[PDB]
Design a protein around this ligand. Sequence first.
Ligand SMILES: O=C(O)COc1cccc(Cl)c1
Length: 297
Amino acid sequence: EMEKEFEQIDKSGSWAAIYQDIRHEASDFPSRVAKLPKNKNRNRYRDVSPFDHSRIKLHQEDNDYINASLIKMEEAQRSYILTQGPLPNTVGHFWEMVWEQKSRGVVMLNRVMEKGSLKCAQYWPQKEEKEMIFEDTNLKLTLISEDIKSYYTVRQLELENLTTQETREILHFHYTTWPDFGVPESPASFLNFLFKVRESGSLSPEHGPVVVHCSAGIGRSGTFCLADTCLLLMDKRKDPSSVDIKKVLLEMRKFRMGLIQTADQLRFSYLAVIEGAKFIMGDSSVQDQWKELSHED
Ligand SMILES: O=C(O)COc1cccc(Cl)c1
């Protein structure tokens, strides 16, 4: 059981040690396309690249490259696209990807500005009456509605293919109180947020994969899909002891490098899964307690 493993590592203070064993066992696959000189301005960080085998390709003849990976969790029947925060010159590529992959949800785990620096381009509209047009990819994006909670925001967006006049509704889930290289206030507000994404249908197999990002798309983004996948596996087998979070994280690291960036993100992931297991194990009321503790009202 992970809860016992949790106490052993906590009492022995071994998080930095567990974390280094994961770093050392992690997959290394080629990322040749990311490193082509024509793609240097498509990468936010020189040291965070998609592997060639799992990279998302844009359907455009000129240049198919975006810093985005498909993470396919076969047993859980869940897919995720993990990506960087869009750059000023890749906002059009970002929405082209959302369109082409048939995604229903975008999960954003960072603020546009953190620690006095820009972590992400402002890639969605701030007011209903001021829509965004991406000339390079022929898409229009309108803000339909915005629901603000204390520490996250849910936006309904309309994406229009200007080439075919097709429209889709995209849900933007914005977690607004999670610091870079840090961990949420408590497992409670993070779990409340993850359950809200699930409730929307955005993670369901009748849609394309959810798009998840932070600044690099590996740390905070990693924590989100590790907790979701672990809870679904636990669900699927109704056995908390059957789930090894270290093995799931290594399986995810076959698809994108660096998922979970610090030992505290790793400890946070264990905590989130352990608390989440209360619900998965048949205590429905725990979901209402999370909503209370998160103080979203
Ligand atoms: O997602 C996080 O919390 C941390 O991830 C990173 C942020 C910026 C740069 C790099 Cl290399 C990683």
